[PDB]
Design a protein around this ligand. Structure first.
Ligand code: K
Ligand code: K
Ligand code: K
Ligand code: K
Ligand code: K
Ligand code: K
Ligand code: K
Ligand code: K
Ligand code: K
Ligand code: K
Ligand code: K
Ligand code: K
Ligand code: K
Ligand code: K
Ligand code: K
Ligand code: K
Ligand code: K
Ligand code: K
Ligand code: K
Ligand code: K
Ligand code: K
Ligand code: K
Ligand code: K
Ligand code: K
Ligand code: K
Ligand code: K
Ligand code: K
Ligand code: K
Ligand code: K
Ligand code: K
Ligand code: K
Ligand code: K
Ligand code: K
Ligand code: K
Ligand code: K
Ligand code: K
Ligand code: K
Ligand code: K
Ligand code: K
Ligand code: K
Ligand code: K
Ligand code: K
Ligand code: K
Ligand code: MG
Ligand code: MG
Ligand code: MG
Ligand code: MG
Ligand code: MG
Ligand code: MG
Ligand code: MG
Ligand code: MG
Ligand code: MG
Ligand code: MG
Ligand code: MG
Ligand code: MG
Ligand code: MG
Ligand code: MG
Ligand code: MG
Ligand code: MG
Ligand code: MG
Ligand code: MG
Ligand code: MG
Ligand code: MG
Ligand code: MG
Ligand code: MG
Ligand code: MG
Ligand code: MG
Ligand code: MG
Ligand code: MG
Ligand code: MG
Ligand code: MG
Ligand code: MG
Ligand code: MG
Ligand code: MG
Ligand code: MG
Ligand code: MG
Ligand code: MG
Ligand code: MG
Ligand code: MG
Ligand code: MG
Ligand code: MG
Ligand code: MG
Ligand code: MG
Ligand code: MG
Ligand code: MG
Ligand code: MG
Ligand code: MG
Ligand code: MG
Ligand code: MG
Ligand code: MG
Ligand code: MG
Ligand code: MG
Ligand code: MG
Ligand code: MG
Ligand code: MG
Ligand code: MG
Ligand code: MG
Ligand code: MG
Ligand code: MG
Ligand code: MG
Ligand code: MG
Ligand code: MG
Ligand code: MG
Ligand code: MG
Ligand code: MG
Ligand code: MG
Ligand code: MG
Ligand code: MG
Ligand code: MG
Ligand code: MG
Ligand code: MG
Ligand code: MG
Ligand code: MG
Ligand code: MG
Ligand code: MG
Ligand code: MG
Ligand code: MG
Ligand code: MG
Ligand code: MG
Ligand code: MG
Ligand code: MG
Ligand code: MG
Ligand code: MG
Lengths: 260, 134
RNA sequence: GUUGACCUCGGAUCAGGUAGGAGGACCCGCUGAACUUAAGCAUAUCAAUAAGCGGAGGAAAAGAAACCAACAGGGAUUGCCCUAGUAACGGCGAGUGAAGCGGCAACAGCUCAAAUUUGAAAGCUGGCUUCGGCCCGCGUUGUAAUUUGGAGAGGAUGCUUUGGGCGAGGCUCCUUCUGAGUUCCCUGGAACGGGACGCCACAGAGGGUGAGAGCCCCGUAUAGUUGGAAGCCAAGCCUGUGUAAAGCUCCUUCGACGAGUCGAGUAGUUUGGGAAUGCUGCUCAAAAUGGGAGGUAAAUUUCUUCUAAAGCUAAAUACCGGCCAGAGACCGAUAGCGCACAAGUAGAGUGAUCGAAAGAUGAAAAGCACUUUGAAAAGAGGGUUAAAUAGCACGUGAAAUUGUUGAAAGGGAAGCGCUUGUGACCAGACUUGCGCCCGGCGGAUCAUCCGGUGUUCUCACCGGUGCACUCCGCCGGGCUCAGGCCA
RNA sequence: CCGGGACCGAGGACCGCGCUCUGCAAGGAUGCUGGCGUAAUGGUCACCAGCGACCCGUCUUGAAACACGGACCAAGGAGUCAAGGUUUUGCGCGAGUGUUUGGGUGUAAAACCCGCACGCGUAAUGAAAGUGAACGUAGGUGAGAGCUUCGGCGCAUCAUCGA
RNA sequence: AGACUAAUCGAACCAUCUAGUAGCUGGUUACCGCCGAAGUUUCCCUCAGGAUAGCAGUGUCGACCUUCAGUUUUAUGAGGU
RNA sequence: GCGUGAGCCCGGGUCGAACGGCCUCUAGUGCAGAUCUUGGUGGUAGUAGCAAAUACUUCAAUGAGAACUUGAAGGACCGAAGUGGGGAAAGGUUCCAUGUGAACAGCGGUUGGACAUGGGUUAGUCGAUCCUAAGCCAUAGGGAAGUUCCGUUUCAAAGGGGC
RNA sequence: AAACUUUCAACAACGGAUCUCUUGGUUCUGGCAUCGAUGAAGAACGCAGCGAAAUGCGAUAAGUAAUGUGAAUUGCAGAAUUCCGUGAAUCAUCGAAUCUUUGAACGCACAUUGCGCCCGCCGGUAUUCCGGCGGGCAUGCCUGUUCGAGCGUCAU
């Protein structure tokens, strides 16, 4: 509050009274009379540099750098070693990227939670769903008082085409803990790299995979970036004939023997 | 998850409303389940508890005991059932308070208004299922 | 002379009405500082701000050009972005500082004075009233219709326009109803904990219940469903009719337009406004193609653009003061409002005013019956409880400071660094391991080959064969090697 | 050329320089033997003994100061936030760059999408009216990393004469 | 009498402007590693204060540029202690 | 037990409902000092002191307990400008009776202006009420942007008596 | 050798730090527009079966009527309804009422529970006096009504 600590009429007593110079309350008949005020070191005073509401809470990001980062996250979602290093259980999924036929499209195809839960098990996503259910704890601080009581893990993300699939599948997957949905044309970096860590586990639909290239074509002012290298495999380059045939003979070994 | 904007999910507001509720609201908060026989007979699952009906205890230290409801102490959120008591130092007998959510009603006090309650809830409870069946 | 008017000014506890005070976060005006900065200080700045005074509403205010411009022209008011820290002001120091154009949010236009109804004051307050009007009064020193500059009045000309009543159907508000385990075992005073087996989910938000509960209870999701009231919009139907009133196309001629106001001089204040941007006091004081403006004072000649001195009007904008509601990378009882509590309270001051401290027994009071000592307060037994190492001086219970018990030192401070000694107390390490030979015991099936299946395509696994000088395990005896501390 | 003592043993297959050359004292310690296997070695604390040792913080040329503050303990207690500049580090695009004043949309203060104006940059110089960047393979000379057909070509940058 | 005006008078008491300004006194909170000063020049109503140059740290870039030096030697100038 | 160090880890006791490691993000983030703020506690220390107003003694009763409670008997002081008998201002139940653990009466206390429970203030003649004084404020009027300032008989058409 | 002073541990004291908790603050966002002469905001005094405060109410006083719900309130006690119909409750809702003395505050005053005037009814022999009860009497201004003033001024 703007007036906290400044609702008194204290004044300094000045030197000569054998007390420290600091404003003191005036009057008599209470404990409060004669006590210090207005200081950051005083009980019931004002704090040092009170906080204001015109600090910067939001941040501006170039739209080109936003689009770069979301594309980089989609590419990392098709690398199975990265999925395991982010904590996902994918030992029984047949292929990555995982694509399911449009059997989730019709009216009430998976509009029931029982049907949607059954489909995830057959596809091979069951163990990752059970991982979330078994992880649930009480938060470890004062966040419990402020509306944030529990913590849990993250599960698969489901990407669909609202024009062809029909948007009725959002109801079916909503109540299962850990499962999120997102349309193919509104992808979110907060969901694709939760916590700043890459490799989210994603389940696509056939209609959505067909639309993905058209989505990136219609982005004015953006084209998919070019890389700074061309061959990412470093061992093939160093151990090729083009390079190994012009080198100088080795000058030593990995361990040098001690002389003198 | 809640959707409507008039619903609040706040720990502070929810405890305040519970512990300062008036008397006509405390009646609904103190409900109990019916037994399987009555549940089948009436097609009703729960009802607010009333003085003058039988009860069996299914939780706590006084399990498997039965009796009639002698008082509904809404100011304390407890009920008293006959013959479940305790002795003070002097030897005087004093009843023990049981929360109504860990008893089951095995026989309910009946009158004209009680029958209206049971008929009203049953009719709606089956109309929902009939419309849901389509 | 009498009597009857008119004008102005009064009385009445005459009939009927209306204002004051509170609130003032935001709104419309008046009045008005100094601290401070200029490294001193007077013009300047702080500031056209704080304090003081008057007047309104859910918004107020502003508003349909006496505007901007200088273009190929825009077109009432308000607010955001940009113009722009720019033109300009300033002991030209410190410092200060707008507007037109451009994009958007929101869009909406109007009524008086100045004319003769003059073949008919055609207008209005009040009283009484079968309800249809009647009666006095106001008013010709002007109440209705007609006209407002975009025009209009007055003439031609021949087409077009309008009044009532029903009304399906929909929207808003209140109210009744809504899925699934108290299944079995262990710990525990008490499952809401661990294990096993199930179910619901457009509902796994939140809270309670003897400890972390989707299925014990309230609620949470979804469109529906029982009943009730008042408004708003609206598809489409049924009916009169030109007495009257209204729009359009052309034209010789007409065409009223706000005065101690504009403007000028001078004084003060104010603005970015500079031979003077606005406001107010005093003196002078207009005009009919006249008048204002056109950011450098003046005379002469042109040009452009509007039309002052009378008035009304929704939206986009401000505000958490009032009544409600939803939230947070906020605080967690010396923090957060002065106040989580019988807090603007107790208390102080003649008064204006000043103004605290203070949350937590236990799931449940089950808040200690009885005996005994004591004048009593209380003590000792004995009880309740999972616990009294929870007894209302009540969760946990740190330090300063103090009591008892135990160990030790002390010839005018004590405490501390390096290094031995004595006494007390104590962590590690070690207890065997691999191999070879001899004997006993038990079990297989060791090498090879055939069939099948994988895979790194030559390497494996499974089935069959094997069947005692092979393979594996245990026990008993001997031998070599390696192993802890100090010399 | 022979004796006598003290302190130390880093390194961890071979490789080297060499010599008195079946081998060695030559690029860093091995061999043999005894006692004990636990409070014996070792560690912590208290106390006596030898030597050493002025009260901290602060201003100051100079503090143990007869210079100031400090009886003791617990909890609180001081370079922050906004706008505007500047240099340097990381990132995107690049003669361009910037979605978020606004509109569309949404699982609704998030995420996703759109483009008319506008800001900074692409041209300077004068008080102003105004005017406005190639003689040359975008010049000559001296250095210059790198490349090179070995004759030379010469980046960045510095000095110098010109357009 | 600069005396009295509620223990207050060479200008009372109360709330607000107000967290008034201070070239001046006091304080300013964990550890280890590497480098390491100045009290001097010029100007200021400047003398208990600032700006400016010097002294110091950090980041680099150009070549790893025959490159330099608080020094000696040889040849050759100036000086009035 | 580990670490040069700020620190980290384990054993024993008490206790009763939530908490940590790792990578990023964020800040009201680290105390011995400020005659620092709030609260609590020492030495001094059972220390300084509890000395104006002439003064007490015997027996009995009450009571757990008597110098400061009650009765009687002695000895004294105030000495009618009183330590007597009544009032005004001010206070507000302090008045009376019965009873009482703690706290208060700077020693004690069975006593109390303390603590608990009850009771108590009677007017045609005493006062207020009526009159005017110094003074204060309405009305007629005049100032002032205004909160309001002046004005009290005035430059006012200002009343009361009977049938 | 004790006592005394000093250091460490256990238990017991003094004091209220630490940990966990929260029907309270603080900040943001959204919706709405409603005080008063028909007596407001604020002040005083009273009201419960047993209450000092706090909360509520006004001599109809810890509340009355009306509508909904459907069996309580609770520290003690008593009593009522006990759902037939005639209905518990410091329940919810709220459209009909009551609402002391004041306050812009209004017959004149007020440091007083002070002093008047007008109309009506009821008692005391009463139009005039005394007592009880009911209704009234402020100021500024507007429209209208009625009674007036002035050689201001018209006609006869
Ligand atoms: K203040
Ligand atoms: K002192
Ligand atoms: K979900
Ligand atoms: K009149
Ligand atoms: K405010
Ligand atoms: K004011
Ligand atoms: K411009
Ligand atoms: K008429
Ligand atoms: K008219
Ligand atoms: K209808
Ligand atoms: K049990
Ligand atoms: K159990
Ligand atoms: K369980
Ligand atoms: K003028
Ligand atoms: K003109
Ligand atoms: K001009
Ligand atoms: K406080
Ligand atoms: K007082
Ligand atoms: K237990
Ligand atoms: K016990
Ligand atoms: K306890
Ligand atoms: K070495
Ligand atoms: K100092
Ligand atoms: K000192
Ligand atoms: K940068
Ligand atoms: K541009
Ligand atoms: K070169
Ligand atoms: K005073
Ligand atoms: K100075
Ligand atoms: K000389
Ligand atoms: K322990
Ligand atoms: K003593
Ligand atoms: K004496
Ligand atoms: K005496
Ligand atoms: K009297
Ligand atoms: K008498
Ligand atoms: K009196
Ligand atoms: K009287
Ligand atoms: K007088
Ligand atoms: K006046
Ligand atoms: K705490
Ligand atoms: K009250
Ligand atoms: K009087
Ligand atoms: Mg003051
Ligand atoms: Mg505070
Ligand atoms: Mg914590
Ligand atoms: Mg239960
Ligand atoms: Mg009247
Ligand atoms: Mg007013
Ligand atoms: Mg200031
Ligand atoms: Mg100055
Ligand atoms: Mg200064
Ligand atoms: Mg000065
Ligand atoms: Mg003001
Ligand atoms: Mg209003
Ligand atoms: Mg508005
Ligand atoms: Mg208006
Ligand atoms: Mg006009
Ligand atoms: Mg134009
Ligand atoms: Mg305009
Ligand atoms: Mg600019
Ligand atoms: Mg600017
Ligand atoms: Mg200004
Ligand atoms: Mg017309
Ligand atoms: Mg015409
Ligand atoms: Mg339910
Ligand atoms: Mg719980
Ligand atoms: Mg729950
Ligand atoms: Mg369970
Ligand atoms: Mg005009
Ligand atoms: Mg002025
Ligand atoms: Mg002027
Ligand atoms: Mg909140
Ligand atoms: Mg406290
Ligand atoms: Mg507080
Ligand atoms: Mg406590
Ligand atoms: Mg006892
Ligand atoms: Mg315990
Ligand atoms: Mg205590
Ligand atoms: Mg305790
Ligand atoms: Mg201690
Ligand atoms: Mg010693
Ligand atoms: Mg085999
Ligand atoms: Mg070695
Ligand atoms: Mg040995
Ligand atoms: Mg030893
Ligand atoms: Mg010494
Ligand atoms: Mg000295
Ligand atoms: Mg000093
Ligand atoms: Mg001192
Ligand atoms: Mg704290
Ligand atoms: Mg005095
Ligand atoms: Mg400050
Ligand atoms: Mg100050
Ligand atoms: Mg050095
Ligand atoms: Mg000078
Ligand atoms: Mg100094
Ligand atoms: Mg170079
Ligand atoms: Mg180099
Ligand atoms: Mg000389
Ligand atoms: Mg607990
Ligand atoms: Mg801080
Ligand atoms: Mg401290
Ligand atoms: Mg320090
Ligand atoms: Mg003494
Ligand atoms: Mg004395
Ligand atoms: Mg003395
Ligand atoms: Mg005596
Ligand atoms: Mg005498
Ligand atoms: Mg005498
Ligand atoms: Mg007495
Ligand atoms: Mg007595
Ligand atoms: Mg005493
Ligand atoms: Mg005593
Ligand atoms: Mg006593
Ligand atoms: Mg008393
Ligand atoms: Mg008398
Ligand atoms: Mg007056
Ligand atoms: Mg006047
Ligand atoms: Mg009233
Ligand atoms: Mg009364
Ligand atoms: Mg009366
Ligand atoms: Mg009136």
């Amino acid at each position: 509050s703007e007036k906290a600590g400044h609702q008194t009429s204290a004044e300094s007593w000045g030197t000569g009274r054998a007390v420290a110079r600091i404003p003191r309350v005036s009057g008599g008949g209470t404990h409060r009379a004669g006590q210090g005020a207005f200081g950051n070191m005083c009980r019931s005073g004002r704090m040092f540099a009170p906080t204001k509401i015109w600090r910067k809470w939001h941040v501006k990001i170039n739209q080109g750098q936003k689009r770069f980062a979301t594309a980089s996250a989609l590419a990392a979602s098709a690398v199975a070693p990265l999925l395991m290093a982010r904590g996902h259980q994918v030992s029984t999924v047949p292929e990555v990227p995982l694509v399911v036929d449009s059997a989730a499209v019709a009216g009430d195809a998976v509009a029931k939670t029982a049907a949607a839960y059954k489909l995830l098990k057959a596809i091979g996503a069951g163990p990752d769903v059970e991982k979330v259910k078994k992880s649930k704890k009480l938060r470890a601080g004062k966040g419990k008082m402020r509306g944030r009581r529990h913590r849990q893990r993250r599960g698969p993300l489901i990407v669909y085409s609202p024009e062809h699939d029909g948007k009725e599948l959002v109801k079916g997957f909503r109540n299962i803990p850990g499962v999120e949905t997102c349309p193919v044309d509104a992808l979110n970096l907060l969901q694709l790299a939760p916590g700043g860590h890459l490799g989210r586990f994603i389940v696509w639909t056939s209609a959505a995979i067909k639309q993905l290239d058209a989505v990136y074509e219609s982005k004015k002012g953006f084209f998919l970036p070019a890389n700074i290298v061309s061959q990412a495999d470093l061992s093939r380059l160093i151990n090729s004939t083009e390079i190994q045939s012009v080198l100088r003979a080795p000058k030593g070994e990995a361990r040098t023997k001690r002389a003198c | 998850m809640k959707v409507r904007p008039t619903v609040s999910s706040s720990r502070r507001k929810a405890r305040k409303a519970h512990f300062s509720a008036p008397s006509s609201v405390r009646r609904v908060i103190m409900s109990a389940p019916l037994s399987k026989e009555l549940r089948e007979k009436y097609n009703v699952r729960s009802i607010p508890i009333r003085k003058g009906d039988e009860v069996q205890i299914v939780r706590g230290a006084h399990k498997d005991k039965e009796g009639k409801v002698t008082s509904v102490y809404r100011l304390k959120y407890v009920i008293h059932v006959e013959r479940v008591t305790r002795e003070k130092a002097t030897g005087q007998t004093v009843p023990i308070g049981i929360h109504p959510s860990n008893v089951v009603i095995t026989k309910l006090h009946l009158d004209k208004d009680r029958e209206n309650i049971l008929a009203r809830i049953k009719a709606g409870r089956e109309q929902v299922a009939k419309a849901k069946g389509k």
